[PDB]
From a paper:
A previous report showed that a F. novicida transposon mutant with insertions in cadA (FTT_0406), which encodes a putative aspartate aminotransferase fold (AAT-fold) pyridoxal 5′-phosphate (PLP)-dependent [name] (hereafter referred to as [name]), was attenuated in mouse spleen. Bacterial AAT-fold PLP-dependent basic amino acid decarboxylases are grouped into a superfamily termed LAOdc because these enzymes decarboxylate lysine (LdcI, LdcC and LdcA), arginine (AdcI) and ornithine (OdcI and OdcC) into corresponding polyamines (cadaverine, agmantine and putrescine) while consuming protons and producing CO2. [name] sequences found in Francisellaceae strains display a high level of sequence identity (83%), and contain four functional regions, corresponding to a wing domain (Pfam ID: PF03709), a PLP-binding domain and a AAT-like domain (both corresponding to Pfam ID: PF01276), and a C-terminal domain (Pfam ID: PF03711). It uncovers the important role of this previously uncharacterized protein in survival in the host cells through participation in oxidative stress response, thereby identifying [name] as a potential drug target.
We were able to determine the structure of F. novicida [name] from X-ray diffraction data collected to a resolution of 3.4 Å. In agreement with the relationship between [name] and LdcI families disclosed by the phylogenetic analysis and the relatively high level of sequence conservation, structural alignment between F. novicida [name] and E. coli LdcI dimers extracted from their respective decameric crystal structures demonstrates a high overall similarity, with a root-mean-square-deviation (RMSD) of 1.043 Å over 1,223 aligned atoms. Like LdcI and other LAOdcs, the [name] monomer is organized in three different structural domains: A N-terminal wing domain involved in stabilization of the ring assembly though inter-dimer contacts (residues 1–130), a central core domain which contains a covalently bound PLP cofactor (residues 131–564) and a C-terminal domain (residues 565–713), which partially constitutes an entry channel into the active site. The core domain encompasses a linker region (residues 113–184), a PLP-binding domain consisting of a seven-stranded β-sheet surrounded by eight α-helices (residues 185–419), and an AAT-like domain which harbors an antiparallel four-stranded β-sheet and three α-helices near the dimerization interface (residues 420–564). While the overall structures of [name] and LdcI are very similar, some notable differences were found in both the AAT-like and the C-terminal domains. Moreover, a comparison of the ppGpp binding pocket in LdcI with the equivalent region in [name] revealed that, despite the overall high sequence conservation, only two out of 10 ppGpp-interacting residues are conserved between the two proteins.
Author numbering:
A (entry chain B), B (entry chain A): -5 to 711
C (entry chain C): -5 to 174
């Protein structure tokens, strides 16, 4: 009923050179399907074409085939693509079934050639509208259905289903741009038929339970203000001010944000990295009981054994921890994986024992997985899931949920995250991830195959050498490709779908004589309309998601080796990078691409930046004061602003966040000493290097550029 | 360029009986406007019709009139409706201008009757597409423009502009339902052309500054997780754990939520109310220096004079404080109005000195106004503004902003709140509020005019007797209509647009012999598809917003006196309230509406509920422990669960929230004693009364209904 | 849903010599009602004609009238003929209600002259299909609904929903005569 695809197509596939009366039959119900309830139609010669189309277009919503075109193979493939898809086999009184389908569960019905044709046309339409109703998840379906009502409300939201946008001109332009339905599904608790999110009521409860069942979770919660909010919910549930928490040193901005409002003391788990500035794994040693007890003794406050653990898995650049090996070693009852970058983890075999929800909670221990559903699944931004496992307290976590969830949640986002769960439900999800995985691996192999053919220099991939078999490849001490120190046997895996491209300039995780900085590649990808996830000094991160077709990757390939063409060409910066040229044409007057690149590479070789960034994040500065209490001193006022140089031997009042590499260097309350001088040297270097060449800049969040230009940091008391 | 209204109409208005060659001229450019760039057209007889249409339809985007139809009046009225609206006056070489337009600034150009007609059609199209570009606010326009690009991205969000929803069927149904553009404008910071929200960069800054200028604010911040989040931002900026805060006792759920994670002690400002359970104003006395200093001495913890003040203005039911009179009396430097229910306040004269932003911050004192833009303007849910005033610290509030704002904000919501500012910009906003105000007053006057004619009983309005003049009427001690105690001269105003309907049953703010409970009216409004904002035991709240047409109010009128018709009819509960009847037809077998209603009224008269609710919220229970520390005890575990009866003499661990009236009764950490026995009596009464009649229920958030049904509350230690 | 009169007619009655933009409004939703879900339309000059027609034809299933043509008498008579019959009054931002209707229980909704016309056309269609569902008695409605299912039965009666009449010629003539 009025809820269906945009391009509703029904695929007629009967073998060409049918009988005359069977052709008239299938065409009568084709016209009938068109002229009643506005369908679209394809005609094909065999079912093999349909399975091709289904892997690209999913707005086909029925298959009616003459029995001649019946194919055992296609039905096996259609089975593994869409079990609910309506199928119709038209046959006369002559032929019985193929036995393969006894077991196979498709939505097959059988028509007989006869007088009644428009009857079948109505029969087909019904089983289609059933298919359309029976594919939305509960709350989404409920929400969508409500939209079609006409309610005449005197309540919130104030736009009251769109009527408020119509009164003004700019309102009308906004309304038309975004579409009727987004406003008609913008409801509040004042429309009681859906219940509440914070209450987990009629519709919402059904949605929350659905998601939990889908992700193999004991209990799941939907969050409409990003994983940043989900992380804080977990914390304020697990942690009361006073006890100690175990923190991944390479954690999200939001982890610190949580620490900053509860009087809690962290010990950080020292992770590895390479000269590229790629986040590595926390070695197993750090998780051991003895390492924890010792680090507690050495911390300043350090109440006792941590009640709370937060480890980011996977890393931004796609390294995966074995979650089984971690839980075996971590005797912390509230341990929380920040799995923002792997909501798909639980749906593919290659991630066996690499997602939180895969482990059985140890007796009276609680597991938390926070996932950013929008980050790598199909959902609206700000939409996130909170999966928990084991014995838990609804009475108190509901309050922790209420602490951060708004009282007027935006229902389309609620629907969107539930719908993303329904996308992953069943072997539907497996194929969805399998595609993006196979595509990524193809891009990896296709790029090194180009490196072989390539003359002179060429790009490279941050991956093992042998990637023949399709797995999340395991890092090994032996191989120097990852550039990490002391990695354990069978602990770290590489996520195939996260492709890090490497530009010449890093030999043995240190500086290089000749190179080509990544910044001059990123800009060239930007000139040719390509958006990169992250750009290192010599690396480049592309994330192949379920929204990445092979065509996109061919575009990426073609522009990439074109950059080499135009760089070996040594074309003018004007003709090659017009945006960079336009920033200062006086400076780039007759400059060519090689001059610009080599001058940037020279200044990094002169600054000795790679191993500076190495030793900067490989030391951990003396923690003087609780991040919470450091922020509190900002409020209370006891803090003074002194230049970056004078940060030495003082206690930082705010977080410092340099780009590159886009990683917290120091948290609020920590202090730099002789031991941790490395980080301040790296910072002061970023200043000089960030100025020199126009168009290539540096940023450090936390300090303040004054009138005089000098950058002061606020230090405590 | 490809950004325009849906029904782009251009109004031709030339006086009937034109000249033959002038007729053909205007028609040649009408056809040209239709067949090129797909315009729609109206023809009218005089400009007076146009001003009528413009006040109902704002997708007319040009007016081309023959000079005969020129009207001095209409052009003054069109001026006060849309100055940017393109106007075209076609005239021959015969007539000079009317002088009125010297002052008036319309978008008038002048055409001359001649050969070149299609030229003018192109000239008209340009000045229209200029109008379409020049009405969106900066970030919204920038966001909308980006949608039209084709970027081939390998970044977040994972749906990558919608391409991820296409791979699956349920994805496609979700994608089609909501529309292409909502996904193409779902961006991240990874597309650097817009900058960041938390950074307040190129596009965002322009939007943030625009809003601040629009609402007459020193500095404004946009919030994408509701005012609930905005409130917490304000708090964690203004408050460090240890000092005391001044709280409106009738505050939002979110105010407490803020208190629960900062170690802060509140003193509550006792507000008034009536038997109906309508939230009243805090009397001026409570704000005085002596009342504050005294209540501090009397509190348990009470560090010192509060650094932070939070008062909710307006009330849920539309009572307004004089913000000037408050700031004069409250020597608290960080004072924060929770103006969720009045984002429109600053745009209409009747709210003079009733909004925060209207007062000059006292030297070194900071003012905060948090507004729920979605609550009573045209914006998406979760969208809220944070307006501040005076000397402030960006370096620290940026951290407070970052503490609660997600790292991946949903850009359409960002755009939506900025667009809502642009809707209010200029006298555009004045007329928008003036309409909803005049409509409200009309509904009020027409309803009491119906009460006069009405036979026997009828509804009433919670308003003064004399409402002849169009003002925010001021409450007076003398008049018994508001039922409040000790109201000050010129302190409390009634917001016209918030209509509270009253059903018989409350005589002199106490019980009544005969009545008709509001619940049996709400259900009847629900049966007839009408959504109420809030329902009291004998009241009903309709909020007339800018999304409320007169047709809605006539629908509301017609169903209302129909309820009286069917109640005086004494129709069967089956035929009158089928949903209620269906819940238990065994019980309502042959019951009529009067029996059901009178039995409910009798049980409230027997329970003595109205004055029970009165004395419940008019006492304030002994605060035993900080709300923060009470919640912390849940985490730490020191808490036991005992039934509601046994809450007496114990310290509550969680907030209790009864419906009715939908107001916090006790906060975490407070304790009931003999003095505050009233509230627990009211609670235990709500149990008995909530059971008895089927379909009419009661709810109390905070306790827990067990297996046996009995409701335990968790009490501390 | 697919259960309705044969001649589904919707009576537009707006006073001749309407305003130009109000004429286009009611006609835009008249065409919209025709071309989507196949309605039939009458145009009349006053409501007095409608009460005449209702006492002869009961396949009119909605009345959408401009507020000019509002009539106190006809609404009292329509009340005593069909309380459930959908009524729609289109009016601009100018006029409040006549008090007679306070007591009278019709199926009146109110439209406002504005941009959104096809929206109202969808709003009208919904309140009509509600009227069509809400007039059959329980068992009749249940029986009628079942007919629209496709069940593939192996039970009694032996004709199994008509399929048995199709196999023979005389069967087909009997089936066609009496109807699916």
């Amino acid at each position: 009923e009025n809820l269906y695809f945009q391009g509703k197509t029904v695929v007629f596939v009967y073998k060409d050179t049918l009988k005359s009366y069977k052709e008239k039959f299938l065409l009568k119900i084709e016209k009938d399907l068109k002229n009643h309830h506005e369908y679209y139609t394809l005609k094909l010669d065999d079912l093999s074409e349909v399975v091709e189309i289904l892997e690209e277009n999913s707005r086909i919503c029925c298959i009616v085939l003459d029995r001649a075109s019946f194919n055992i193979e296609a039905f096996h493939n259609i089975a593994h693509l869409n079990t609910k898809l309506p199928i119709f086999v038209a046959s006369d009184y002559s032929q019985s079934i193929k036995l393969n389908l006894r077991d196979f569960n498709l939505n097959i019905n059988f028509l007989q050639y006869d007088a009644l044709a428009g009857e079948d046309s109505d029969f087909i339409h019904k089983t289609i509208t059933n298919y359309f109703n029976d594919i939305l998840p509960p709350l989404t379906y409920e929400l969508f259905k409500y939209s079609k009502s006409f309610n005449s409300a005197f309540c919130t939201p104030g736009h009251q289903g769109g009527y408020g946008f119509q009164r003004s001109a700019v309102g009308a332009l906004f309304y038309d741009f975004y579409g009727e339905n987004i406003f008609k599904t913008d409801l509040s608790i004042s429309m009681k038929e859906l219940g509440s999110l914070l209450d987990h009521s009629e519709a919402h409860k059904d949605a929350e339970e659905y998601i939990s069942k889908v992700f193999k979770s004991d209990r799941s919660l939907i969050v409409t203000n990003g994983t940043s909010t989900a992380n804080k919910i977990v914390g304020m549930y697990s942690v009361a001010d006073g006890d100690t928490i175990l923190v991944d040193r390479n954690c999200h901005k939001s982890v610190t944000h949580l620490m900053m409002m509860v009087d809690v003391n962290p010990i950080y788990l020292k992770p590895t990295r390479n000269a590229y500035g790629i986040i590595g794994g926390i070695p197993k040693k750090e998780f051991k009981r003895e390492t924890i007890q010792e680090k507690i003794d050495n911390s300043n406050i350090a109440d006792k054994w941590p009640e709370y653990a937060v480890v980011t898995n996977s890393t931004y650049d796609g390294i995966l921890y074995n979650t089984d090996t971690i839980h075996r070693e971590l005797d912390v009852k509230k341990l929380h994986f920040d799995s923002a970058w792997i909501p798909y983890a639980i749906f593919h075999p290659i991630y066996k024992h690499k997602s939180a929800m895969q482990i059985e909670p140890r007796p009276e221990h609680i597991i938390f997985e926070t996932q950013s559903t929008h980050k790598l699944l199909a959902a609206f931004s700000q939409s996130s899931m909170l999966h928990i496992k084991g014995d838990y307290n609804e009475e108190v976590l509901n309050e922790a949920f209420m602490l951060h969830t708004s009282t007027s949640p935006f229902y389309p986002i609620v629907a969107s995250v539930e719908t993303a769960a329904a996308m992953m439900e069943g072997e539907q999800g497996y194929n969805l991830i399998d595609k993006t995985i196979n595509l990524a691996i193809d891009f990896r192999r296709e790029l090194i195959k180009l490196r072989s053919e390539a003359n002179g220099w060429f790009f490279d991939v941050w991956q093992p050498d042998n990637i023949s078999n399709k797995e999340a490849w395991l890092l090994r001490n032996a191989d120097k490709w990852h550039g990490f120190k002391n990695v354990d046997g069978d602990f770290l895996s590489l996520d195939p779908i996260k492709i890090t491209i490497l530009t010449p300039g890093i030999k043995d995780n240190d500086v290089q004589d000749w190179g080509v900085p990544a910044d001059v590649v990123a800009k060239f990808l930007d000139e040719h309309d390509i958006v990169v996830e992250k750009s290192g000094p010599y690396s480049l991160l592309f994330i192949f998601s379920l929204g990445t077709t092979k065509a996109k990757s061919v575009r990426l390939i073609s522009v990439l080796n074109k950059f080499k063409q135009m760089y070996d060409e040594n074309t003018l910066v004007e003709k090659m990078l017009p945006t960079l040229y336009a920033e200062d044409p006086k400076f780039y007057e007759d400059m060519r691409i090689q001059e610009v690149s080599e001058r940037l590479h020279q200044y990094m070789k002169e600054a000795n930046l790679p191993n500076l960034m190495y030793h900067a994040f490989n030391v951990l500065p003396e923690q003087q004061l609780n991040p919470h209490r450091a922020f509190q001193k900002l409020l209370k006022g006891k803090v003074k602003k002194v230049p970056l140089a004078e940060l030495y031997e003082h206690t930082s009042a705010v977080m410092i966040l340099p780009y590159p590499p886009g990683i917290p260097v120091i948290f609020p309350g920590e202090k730099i000493t002789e031991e941790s001088k490395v980080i301040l040297d790296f910072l002061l270097m970023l200043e000089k290097i960030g100025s020199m060449l126009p168009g290539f800049d540096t940023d450090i969040h936390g300090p303040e550029r004054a009138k005089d230009g000098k950058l002061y940091i606020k230090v405590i008391d």
